[PDB]
Subunit: 319 residues, 4 copies
């Protein structure tokens, strides 16, 4: 029994048979799936790329139960997980160039497949988890952690520089942990989440309600090298745009709004604006290595029965 | 010596005789032979910016002969063919300066803006040694146009053998085509004037497309499958959305300065992982562009004018019929 | 069932014999027209490398028409004009594999060494490690790119050189490809080949500077004209050309080495560490190969080869150890 | 102020003469700085022997690792104030015109003037644009070992093309070794120490070295190929043929070998294993001003702290002999 979406904007229905795996495929008993905004947003079905009934979740981890034909590397019982990436075309320039996250023919778990008691995934797109970190602990890495690490690595930032993380959400606190493990200096925007970040290794904290972030960073850091925007809102977007020094990189981690962007201030200051959706297998494995090295989350455990309500809570903003 | 100056903003420049000052330590006085015209010049004359400049001698695109050297000058001799770029001087202390990114120096002094024809003074370490075989009018438009284009191409993270679009073949457009072809790339032209399109095809453009006749985004997505880089010379909302759409997943938009806040759908960018970025290049950039011009791989097409008809030229710029260079000879 | 030449024993002639043409799941067998001749091929016959093959077919440079598809192959169609590179297959699991650096996979299978080569008219290869050739360039024309061309393109890409800089090529067949490739990449190039017949050919290919190491000194010349080069792609790796290449590079420049001689070469870190010289690789990845293929199909790269028959293969190897060979050779299947 | 007694090289392979010398007056764009503590490098000794083809012109006062107070400013000096805590690096001056200079690669300027070689190093004169602003909370003796050792280390690490979270070997734990460990751990890497001295190895393990290995007791290459599967980078401080072969072997396919020392040997290179494995071998002597300032930021961040012994100028000459004996831990000359 699993939760499935029959129709969009309609509550998920709770028994389906666990299908047999074909050649080069894997059936994995789910131990803990993670909740993403991608999940809710797929559930509403309001996206240009729309997902027949299917099962959400791209953040599932567990034990290997069934292997397909031709499986030689993954053994039955390995602690592994299934990321947003289900499968790529392996033929496009992105795929063949270690940029498979941009494959046009990518199949995404929970969208183009039945995402995360047993889930089927291709053996070459599953992540080997560390042998000493609980499955609930590795859960946010399948989407949040790896996207953060991909953005941070895409912020063209050398160790020992300054980076802003706008909005300390789940992605926020993972981003702080990772940047500190990457050997950078960090700054962010709830005063309690600020305090949590300061305890996490944030060298600077600033509430945008109390004071102005741009002037502060311009009088203390002289502009930051990178800005990782977890919570993309117009206010935090202008703030990010301003908080960066000349030539710095603003990384974006997906509301449907068209945001005004000054073509003057950027060209003058040479600010580069990147966007990062999810990391690759390599990124995923490194993020897992950083988690297993104990350098990196705080999540709340819930039951399948409470899945629908959680989505409602997500719409209310109480999370 | 008589020179044109801005007495007041939005007011025609007065041609008034001005004294040629004496160069101090580390300064050089240079006979101007030909200055080049940028939209930066007109826009500085109107002074319509939070960073406003009076009275100031315009032009950041002047070239000529070394006449007077300062005290302590050892490398540049009296009589060298040199030019003076948009960069007049930097602070040499900020991390941009010390990191070979001096074009981003907070305390940069800009020629024709923060400083002042016939004879101009410049700091000896911010002047570009031009090639000894290319005419002064020919190398003149590179000081801003050429080097900014070359810095944008270098800023597009594009390896040789890939595809790049040039939205609007202006002066900067044809300079960009020449430079990208000398860089060993594949190019496309979105200029809306079929005659400029034909000129680009004659320059080495593998693809040409008028945005009025057909849609560029679908065309490039059905032929090239999206381009790796997009260098926007003429930044307009129409050319901006088409530029955004012309890029393949993971590509870079290079922008070369309208006062509008442009809407951008951040969903399509983050989803496709598109990167959006070069006002002027550094000394290195300038020298490299000059080497490419002296190798005859980049030849510009300019219109020569007299100093007296400057205001008329600005009027033409505002009128939109317009690269132009003034010839002292 | 046809006739093919194979290695029975090392330093012993490849004998021809009819072999059964074996098409596994997710594998592809293609009738080959391109035979590949490389130095790497010959030394597998000598087997002098510590990593030696288990007998029995050489050649990692075969191209032709797709004949047989495996089970589950959906991208490659029967009749596609394709080729098979030095890379037969990787483990697809190591960090090199997972990071688009599959040329460094520990568990790589190489064609002509760990598997059967393109010496037979028909060879089997994994569908995800074959190169789709251009639709307008002859099989004989694209054939030497499968190893020479792509190693060159990977070396140039590994010389950390921005277009409009200077690069030296120390110019055989591999060298002669390298010149074309660098000019199409938009660089300024120089030739340290010591043969004026090859030197003039390089000047005809687009080499801006040429210098014979017997007549004059290259290091002093380049330090008095270019002031040292940014990169040096060494095709023919010999101690003399090694010292020369090292000296010809400017401060901070990159030394590219392509050959594989069995010598331990003296190199003083005084010269390198003082000048900050970086010394770097051969055989590119799938992306690299495809790039070289695009460069050839754009007509910017055109090899010069001599066509031979399969039967004379040992003769060719013999001539190769004799040193009278200069310029790549592709045996025909017409 | 006044004028003061200083140690100088009269002739090569001959002990330094301690004799009173003038404090020269700084011209336009020049600076006179009170010396508070200089650091001792192998570059100094090797310049004293003068055994390099690039030989200096005697007399010349060695030491490229001096820090202290700004005393006199030149004409046109506007950024550095009289009394700033600054230091003078191996780099005295560049030509500011060559492509290396113009491109923020001034460390390779053909016309570079080096302190302690082409110029001298109680008071030293230096160019105002090639001096390092020290952190405002670190003693002079503490920042002294960074001027050549630390910044060359940080430049080598930056020259090892290593992303954070990878593995790097440090061959030989000298002064530069322990500085390298400190920097790599502050850079967020995983480290290994092939120091053969088990006690300095233990110090490295105390510094944050995840792995330690004595090459006398065990084989390093086999160990790293069975534990890490080869390291991404190898920073060689103490360059000897044995540790050179070891470094070459310790790296995984495609890794980068960084070299710090400068022995006069011509070293064999088996380019077959390198070409096979695609190994890159880069040489790196010193960082630039940017590098230097960053290393100082890391020291002022309290993330880097060297261990040095303070000695007197009178026994500096003796120290040279101690180094030739190999009984030498970084050494700093105090002037309290
Ligand atoms: Zn998600
Ligand atoms: Zn794909
Ligand atoms: Zn301009
Ligand atoms: Zn500055
Ligand atoms: Zn070969
Ligand atoms: Zn592998
Ligand atoms: Zn030193
Ligand atoms: Zn210089």
């Amino acid at each position: 029994k699993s939760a499935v979406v029959r129709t969009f904007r309609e509550p998920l229905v709770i028994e389906v048979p666990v299908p047999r795996p074909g050649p080069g495929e894997i059936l994995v008993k789910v131990a803990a799936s993670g909740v993403c905004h991608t999940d809710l947003h797929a559930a509403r079905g309001d996206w240009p790329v729309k997902p027949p009934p299917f099962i959400p979740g791209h953040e599932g981890v567990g034990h290997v139960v069934a292997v397909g034909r031709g499986v030689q590397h993954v053994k039955e019982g390995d602690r592994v997980g299934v990321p947003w990436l289900y499968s790529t075309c392996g033929h496009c320039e992105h795929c063949l160039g270690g940029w498979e996250t941009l494959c046009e023919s990518q199949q995404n778990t929970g969208y183009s497949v039945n995402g995360g008691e047993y889930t089927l995934a291709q053996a070459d797109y599953v992540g080997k988890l560390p042998d000493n970190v609980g499955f609930v602990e590795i859960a946010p890495v399948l989407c949040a952690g790896v996207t953060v690490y991909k953005g941070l690595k895409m912020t063209d930032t050398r160790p020992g520089q300054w980076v802003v993380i706008s909005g300390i959400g789940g992605l926020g606190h993972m981003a702080v942990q990772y940047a500190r493990a990457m050997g950078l200096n960090v700054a962010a925007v709830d005063d309690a989440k600020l305090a949590l970040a300061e305890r996490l290794g944030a060298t600077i904290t600033v509430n945008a309600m109390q004071t102005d972030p741009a002037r502060y960073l311009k009088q203390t850091i002289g502009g930051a090298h990178g800005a990782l925007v977890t919570a993309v809102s117009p206010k935090a977007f202008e703030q990010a745009l301003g908080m960066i020094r000349r030539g710095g990189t603003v990384a974006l981690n997906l509301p449907p709004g068209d945001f005004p962007l000054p073509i003057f201030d950027m060209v003058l200051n040479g600010i580069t604006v990147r966007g990062s959706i999810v990391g690759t297998r390599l990124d995923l494995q490194e993020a897992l290595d950083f988690a297993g090295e104990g350098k990196v989350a705080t999540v709340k455990t819930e039951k399948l029965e409470n899945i629908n309500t959680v989505f409602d809570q997500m719409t209310q903003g109480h999370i």
